[PDB]
Protein: Restriction endonuclease (NhoI)
Amino acid sequence: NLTTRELLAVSRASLRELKRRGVIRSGNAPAGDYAELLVQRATDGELANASQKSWDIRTTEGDRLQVKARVITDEHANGERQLSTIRSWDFDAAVIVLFDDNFRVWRAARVPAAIMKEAAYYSQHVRGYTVYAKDALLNHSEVEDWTEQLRSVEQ
Amino acid sequence: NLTTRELLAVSRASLRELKRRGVIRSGNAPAGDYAELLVQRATDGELANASQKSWDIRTTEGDRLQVKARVITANGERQLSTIRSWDFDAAVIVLFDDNFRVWRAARVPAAIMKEAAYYSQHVRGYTVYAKDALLNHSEVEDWTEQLRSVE
Ligand SMILES: [Ca+2]
Ligand SMILES: [Ca+2]
Structure:
């Protein structure tokens, strides 16, 4: 095993190259970048440009998808189901991708924008909305389980 | 350099380890997590709970610290993330080089941060550039060697 410092530089350099080759967009958010790749492969959707802030992937049938992803360490850690801030509701559905400790897909779900809003909380500190990816959201009857589909593409 | 598939496995394995060691939390902010670890270790401070958004680390003497970090590879790289709360005692600025060794680090009182920030209307917050002029004096403390020590 190597030092923490080297590991960061190992990860940042690999991501930097993957980013120049056009497979990913940013190098700044590994879990989100991975989930984008995975949702792009599972749908053959097109990536947004970096400038498109309301959504990340557009399916060929039209759907605009905001991809939110996070690494989970313990399915029972309720505070770890917290997703990064949403600052625009101008999309058709979100895709929530929860990774385990291996950065393999633990659960993934397609949530209509309406159900996301219903679950969100506004925050003035961040100028956005906070959503917790609780089981009750993940198993909501208008949510699609995308777990095995994203495991079929890598991770 | 290598094949795309190997880079994915190279990045995924490195992240796997960083995450096992507790160095990474959500996976979206590697550099930020590390800078926090370094400032938490260079002090004996406590990490903020989920609800406390105004600061990141509380020192044993009380001080609440908002940590802002960037990898330095050019004024556009000195740009820090948006501040939307002034409810903290000082900011700790951590500039890494590409190897993630600490290149410059500085403890800036809230007053000097405010003095150096400018409000931005489209983002509804304040932006601070970690220029040398801030890093040197203005009554800010050099924390560079201190953060390199806990490395
Ligand atoms: Ca996203
Ligand atoms: Ca921070």
